[PDB]
Amino acid sequence: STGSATTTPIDSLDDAYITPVQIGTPAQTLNLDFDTGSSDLWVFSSETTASEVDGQTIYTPSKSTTAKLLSGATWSISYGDGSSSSGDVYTDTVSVGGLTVTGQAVESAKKVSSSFTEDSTIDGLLGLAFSTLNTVSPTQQKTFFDNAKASLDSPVFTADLGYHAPGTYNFGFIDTTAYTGSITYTAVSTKQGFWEWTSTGYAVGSGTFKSTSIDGIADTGTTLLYLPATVVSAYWAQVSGAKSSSSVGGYVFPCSATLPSFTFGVGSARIVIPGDYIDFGPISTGSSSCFGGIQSSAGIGINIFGDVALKAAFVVFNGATTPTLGFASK
């Protein structure tokens, strides 16, 4: 089997991407944030505290003839941005782009933090990291991909995120029309539960490539590119007037600037992030100071190849017995 679904930016900045997911019988379609940095499939629901729902579409398990309470199971997750959610668990039929999993754990939110409430466009998350990170207790549950994998034509999924445009998540096949050149594959460590890999270096604009190992995670659920402070300083030093602002929480730059590209290494291959992809717009409406899309990972504890980086590539998440990651230009 295979599946193929379009993923759409939630706003004009590509702050996140939503993908429609069918849950239950008859189907209830919710728009979920596919997150290769976490491993829980959770949804706004008829159980979510009413004051914490503000425009999201909810899953109502009592209206699904295939929903079954997973007795005694609870979940609770905290994300890197400080947001959180928690609740109880159903199993139900879940389909993505024509690919169906029966008995998928659907984590129903009883509580969500303010950032989730305030984003009416995201109805929940669909985790695509390794199932060892799943938070369900006392019986840990599998991700949608892990449940689907054995049925897929090939044990892979791909992320093809658009810049200010829709893109695609495919399951079970590699669309050879979706990228240019060849896909370069690179080793993954699953020891932290992530799609963790080592980039071979970077360049800023037309500058020379610096060979240096940068260990980080391929994370579709993180907006920006978070790299070591040395690398980030080297980038922003090429932008007149750019500075790290403690009051804003990172690097900002004059909105009048033309940003340089940023290249990262995948083995001997190179992925080029155009400068425009690094512009996250005014810090507040009407401001001439703009948010940067490359930020320091110092204090996170891990480097994160978020959407800014991934959207410049066609990315293969290879769930073979020994997982690997592939990157191609597009």
Ligand X SMILES: CCCn1c2c(c(SC(C)C)nc1=O)CCC2
Distances (CA, A) of 297 to 31, 231, 309: 29, 10, 14
Q: x-or-dash pattern for ligand X, window 257-296, by CB under 6 A? A: -----------------------x----------x---x-
Q: What angle do CA 76, 8, 330 make, to 5 degrees?
A: 115
β-bridge pairing 225-227 and 303-305: antiparallel
Q: What x/- string results for residues 295 through 324 when contact with ligand X is judged by CB under 6 A?
A: x-----------------------------
Is residue 10 close enough to count as binding ligand X by CB under 6 A?
Answer: no
Residues 213-232 that bind ligand X (CB under 6 A): none
Least distance (Å) between residue 292 CB and ligand X: 6
In sequence order, the β-bridge partners of residue 170 are 4, 158
Among the options 35, 40, 119, 219, which is catalytic? 35
Among 13, 58, 178, 272, binds ligand X (CB under 6 A): 13
Q: Which tokens belong to 269?
A: 């291959």
Q: Cβ closer to ligand X: 90 or 116?
A: 116
Selected range binding ligand X among 100-108, 112-120, 247-255, 318-326, rule: CB under 6 A:
247-255
Closest CA to 220 of 318, 128, 154, 142: 128
Return the structure tokens found at 279.
């512009």
Q: From the CB of 218, what's the least distance to ligand X, in Å?
A: 20
Residue 146 found at the interface with ligand X (CB under 6 A):
no
Q: Which residues pair with 20 in a beta bridge?
A: 31
CA torsion sign for 210, 216, 219, 223 is negative
> Is there a catalytic annotation at residue 108?
no
Burial class (CB within 10 angstroms; exposed 0-12, middle 13-18, buried 19+) of 311 = buried
Q: How far is the CB of 253 from ligand X (least distance, A)?
A: 10
Regarding 15 and contact with ligand X (CB under 6 A), the answer is yes
Alpha-carbon distance values, 107 to 37, 69, 173, 220 (Å): 17, 10, 27, 20
250 binds ligand X (CB under 6 A): yes
Residue 199 falls in the annotated catalytic set: yes
Cβ proximity of 317 and 130 under 8 Å? no
Cβ closest to ligand X, residue 246 vs residue 258: 246
Query: Could you say which of 199, 261, 296, 297 is catalytic?
Result: 199
- Enumerate binding residues for ligand X (CB under 6 A): 13, 15, 248-250, 280, 291, 295
What amino acid positions are annotated as catalytic residues?
35, 199
